[PDB]
Protein: Renin
Amino acid sequence: GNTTSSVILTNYMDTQYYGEIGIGTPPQTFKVVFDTGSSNVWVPSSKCSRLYTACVYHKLFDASDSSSYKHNGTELTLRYSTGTVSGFLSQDIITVGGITVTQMFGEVTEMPALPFMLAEFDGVVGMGFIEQAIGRVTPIFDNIISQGVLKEDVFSFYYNRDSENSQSLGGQIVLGGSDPQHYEGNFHYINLIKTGVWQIQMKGVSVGSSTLLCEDGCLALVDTGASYISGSTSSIEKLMEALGAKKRLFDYVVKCNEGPTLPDISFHLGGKEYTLTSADYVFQESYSSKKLCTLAIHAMDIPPPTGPTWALGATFIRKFYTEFDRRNNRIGFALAR
Ligand SMILES: CNC[C@H](CC1CCCCC1)NC(=O)N1CCC[C@@H]([C@@](O)(CCCCOC)c2cccc(Cl)c2)C1
Ligand SMILES: *[C@@H]1O[C@H](CO)[C@@H](O[C@@H]2O[C@H](CO)[C@@H](O)[C@H](O)[C@H]2NC(C)=O)[C@H](O)[C@H]1NC(C)=O
Ligand SMILES: [Cl-]
Structure:
């Protein structure tokens, strides 16, 4: 085909990016994260007990209001690092952008307060491969490719910096291609290590000039559902030590007044140096020496098979517009704008 649909994304404080999909007939709208690190679609169910506070404060899907709804009922449990949800499988029509696909998804009936009482979105749309799909449910992008409507079998992410301004696009995904209005120059392409996970090799990670970490190679998951860049505890410990950063309960901080003069951090990908300055990775609420400012980087120990691995989240994708290419099993980076 020749189609490329775009989906507008909301940017909440430069930490949560999500868009909107419609489920059912007539369509019930949900705010969802589009997550390349996972492969299942799910939203909270009307059958989720209000005993779960997350299901009081988020949109629920009511199967009995959709004429296109088709019952399945098989149990589903999804364990992410940050917490588990459970429920059962349902089939219905899902619209994303201008596209409309019949999709199997989770109706979630168990939804823990941590982390979901902190979620500004209702559910997630996993943009990963069927290899990572729990229950081997066919991922939504696979079902879209099957339609043969897409100009190209790729999708791309633009995440924007948060702006007080009313308009200001928080972010954008394109199904079928990439929007040259939000990247300059050409895509540098890097092959996946293997099909089945949006992960590439990384030759090193530099702090300042000294190529300090990952000196002899490591993995990089390009993860749109991740808010910060993550590395292994032991990598991150070193990195934070280099920066003089202090470990708090939920984050790493520096004195705000010194954030600006902290060193660059470069990720060596596909033969090229991808650099983030301290302006890229410090949340500079102020520049006072009496306040502490959060870094958009933290530790996450991801278990095998996928880990140990770094994850390149929104901190990274903000600077580099990212194209996920399913036809060629590669990822492209171009400077964002
Ligand atoms: C596998 N991929 C990475 C994984 C995805 C995540 C999707 C929702 C359900 C759980 C798994 N994110 C992840 O591990 N993060 C670190 C913990 C906080 C997340 C996150 O910041 C993500 C916000 C949306 C995306 O922003 C870019 C957050 C905050 C509050 C509540 C929840 Cl629910 C999740 C980002
Ligand atoms: C829910 O989905 C499951 C998984 O796709 C369906 O189970 C499969 O159904 C097909 C068609 O009858 C069988 O060929 C497979 O062997 C089934 N998988 C197995 C081994 O369980 C199930 O039928 C769906 N539920 C309903 C009632 O539609
Ligand atoms: Cl290391």
Observations:
- The chain has five helices and 25 strands.
- The radius of gyration is 20 Å.
- Residues 154 and 325 are 4 Å apart (CA to CA).
- The first helix runs from residue 113 to 116.
